[PDB]
Design a protein around this ligand. Structure first.
Ligand SMILES: [Fe+3]
Length: 331
């Protein structure tokens, strides 16, 4: 009863190893176990699982779309939840963080340098670019090029740096792993902090995860859709959108989902939020959001009938779909 977890590169690899070793000490020998398979990007993890080389990997809802597509055909099986065990949230808010006093508003993002969690991810890409692409007087709608031209240099992890070097200007190569310091929610944040980009498309918990003190966080703001700015504390009324939970995907058939649930259930039971000091499934000295998001507080089993589209919902799938085809209101 072994679940082959897909770690994306070194840090994740290291956490996966500790995840395997610590589970071995709390799970009876006849229980689920963790086998660590290391890959270079989430995409490879998707391909590996589809090829029956790995069994599970956690993906942002946006990337759940990709995993679904044939010949992958993966499905969401266990979702992460946030907030607290006492008030679980299977969603989060996409926010546009900026430094206080940088002056620009949402409508003045053109020519700025942007930091994205990753190409095709909910908060760092789908939401912001979605609300942006069609308003573009410019019909360079094959997205990447249009975005590369809209902003004056960015970091969009997993974007093809060869065709669009503009998209990797802030993080040369657009590394698609935590080895790239500007990867993910917190990487995109560092990109802003360091002053490499003017804005960071991340989530409502991101700043709180990186800045322990209100005084420092006070030097940042959120860009609201009505072209005004709000304090990072007020994301409820200043966020770009509410997006679905990141989730663990598996093969639609022979995915070992049940075994996956067990592993993760028992895992949260022993090393969930604030359970143990010897191991934390939701944090690591090796980095942020390795394997699972630090903001997650546990997991929820996805209903058996749910395929990726039912999970993402009609509007999001349609949006992602139009996004990738540049389908815009009118034509
Ligand atoms: Fe996300």
């Amino acid at each position: 009863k072994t679940v082959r977890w897909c770690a994306v590169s070194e840090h994740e690899a290291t956490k996966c190893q500790s995840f395997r070793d610590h589970m071995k000490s709390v799970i009876p020998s006849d229980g689920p176990s963790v086998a660590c398979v290391k890959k270079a990007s989430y995409l490879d993890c998707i391909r590996a699982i589809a090829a029956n080389e790995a069994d599970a990997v956690t993906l942002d809802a946006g990337l759940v779309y990709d995993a679904y597509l044939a010949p992958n055909n993966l499905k969401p099986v266990v979702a992460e939840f946030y907030g607290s065990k006492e008030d679980p949230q299977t969603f989060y808010y996409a926010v546009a963080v900026v430094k206080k006093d940088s002056g620009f508003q949402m409508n003045q993002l053109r020519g700025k340098k942007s930091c994205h969690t990753g190409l095709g991810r909910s908060a760092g890409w789908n939401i912001p670019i979605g609300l942006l692409y069609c308003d573009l007087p410019e019909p360079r709608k094959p997205l990447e090029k249009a975005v590369a031209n809209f902003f004056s240099g960015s970091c969009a992890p997993c974007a093809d740096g060869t065709d669009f070097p503009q998209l990797c200007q802030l993080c040369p190569g657009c590394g698609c792993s935590t080895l790239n310091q500007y990867f993910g929610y917190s990487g995109a944040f560092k990109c802003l902090k360091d002053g490499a980009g003017d804005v960071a498309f991340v989530k409502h918990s991101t700043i709180f995860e990186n800045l322990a003190n209100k005084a420092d966080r006070d030097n940042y703001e959120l860009l609201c859709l009505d072209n005004t700015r709000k304090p990072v504390d007020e994301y409820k009324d200043c966020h770009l959108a509410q997006v679905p939970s990141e989730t663990v995907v598996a093969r639609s058939m022979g995915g070992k989902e049940d075994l996956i649930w067990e592993l993760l259930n028992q895992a949260q039971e022993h090393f969930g939020k604030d359970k143990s000091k010897e191991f934390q499934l939701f944090s690591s000295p090796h980095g942020k959001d390795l394997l699972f998001k630090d903001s997650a507080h546990g997991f929820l089993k996805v209903p058996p009938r749910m395929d990726a589209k039912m999970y993402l919902g009609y509007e999001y799938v349609t949006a992602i779909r139009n996004l990738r085809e540049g389908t815009c209101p009118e034509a």
